[PDB]
Amino acid sequence: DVSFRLSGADPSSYGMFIKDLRNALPHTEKVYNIPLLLPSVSGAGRYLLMHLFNYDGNTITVAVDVTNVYIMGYLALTTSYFFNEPAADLASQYVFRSARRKITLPYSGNYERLQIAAGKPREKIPIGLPALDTAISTLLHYDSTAAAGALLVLIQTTAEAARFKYIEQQIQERAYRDEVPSSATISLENSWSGLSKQIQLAQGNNGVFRTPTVLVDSGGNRVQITNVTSNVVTSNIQLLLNTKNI
């Protein structure tokens, strides 16, 4: 399992958490020195448990599928909650089975359905360590509309930061003051599967993407990533989605 406490959190302890989260994900190979997540894991071992504690010390446990870093559901006190999607229903066969009751959220876990549920795109929802403390708190008691925005904060501040060093840094910059994600952050999130695929296709193709990936950079400008020598590949991405899952 991995854990993160908001009480006394700072950029250093958040970075220790994101490092523990990356290191908990199994891999057998690296591709261009980036860990390649597994095609598949059977049974309970598919799910990592992330114990998150709000500033008051209240806790939820979040289940994350280790092949794709997708959050499947969470336990808060004696109730489990899962997204309304078959991968999550599958996860509910393995994790939090000792919950006294199980609620299926009224949406799946993808960004488009979550933003519809929340009533706002994630361009407009501040993220940071304080937003994550709020998100944990929100999830402690069921409210499906509030939970969709809490989950948009939770996914970005845990999974997306694990995938991209730039997003980990953005959150560290927001340790004591939330701010909406930069356009670059949103771009990276939206590009993780595409980048993961092109980095794998570049093995076999002399380091060159079969298809260029368009990203927004730190200055707000749209740029084309065409091969492994790009800073996004050498310095930023930390985990690749296996092409078997794309």
Ligand X SMILES: *[C@@H]1O[C@H](CO)[C@@H](O[C@@H]2O[C@H](CO)[C@@H](O)[C@H](O)[C@H]2NC(C)=O)[C@H](O)[C@H]1NC(C)=O
Near ligand X by CB under 6 A: residue from 200, 230, 236, 238: 230
Is 213 one of the binding residues for ligand X (CB under 6 A)?
Answer: no
Q: Does 83 bind ligand RIP (CB under 6 A)?
A: no
1-9, 23-31, 173-181, 223-231 -> range binding ligand X (CB under 6 A): 223-231
| Minimum distance, C-beta of residue 7 to ligand RIP, in the bound complex (Å) | 27
Catalytic residues, by residue number, are 160
Q: Which of 111, 121, 217, 245 lies at the binding interface for ligand RIP (CB under 6 A)?
A: 111
**Torsion sign (Cα): 65, 13, 185, 136:** positive
- Separation CA 241–CA 160 (nearest Å): 12
Give 70 or 81: the residue with its C-beta nearer to ligand RIP.
70
**226 binds ligand X per the rule CB under 6 A:** yes
**Considering beta carbons, is residue 124 or 141 the nearer one to ligand RIP?**
124
Instruction: Return the axis-axis angle of helices 183-202 and 165-173, rounded to nearest 10°.
Output: 160
* Residue 172 burial (10 A CB sphere; 0-12, 13-18, 19+): middle
Helix then strand then coil, % of the chain, to nearest 5: 40, 25, 35
Q: If binding is defined by CB under 6 A, does position 155 make contact with ligand RIP?
A: yes
Q: Which of 208, 217, 243, 245 binds ligand X (CB under 6 A)?
A: 208
**What is the nearest approach in angstroms of ligand RIP to the Cβ of residue 159?**
5
236 counts as binding ligand X under rule CB under 6 A: no
Rounded distance between C-alpha atoms, residue 246 and residue 228, angstroms: 19
CB of 232 to ligand X, least distance (A): 9
Return d(Cα 237, Cα 230) in angstroms, integer: 11
Tokens, residue 6: 């908001």
Residue 107 backbone phi and psi in degrees, to 5: -155, 155
**Strands in the chain per DSSP E:** 2-5, 27-31, 34-37, 47-53, 59-65, 70-76, 79-82, 101-104, 208-216, 222-227
Residue 120 DSSP symbol: S
Chain residue at closest Cβ approach to ligand RIP: 110
Stretch that binds ligand RIP, among 19-27, 106-114, 118-126, 133-141 (CB under 6 A): 106-114
Residue 110 in contact with ligand RIP, rule: CB under 6 A? yes
Interaction between residue 217 and ligand X (CB under 6 A): no
Residues binding ligand X (CB under 6 A): 208, 226-227, 229-230
Residues binding ligand RIP (CB under 6 A): 70, 109-111, 155, 159
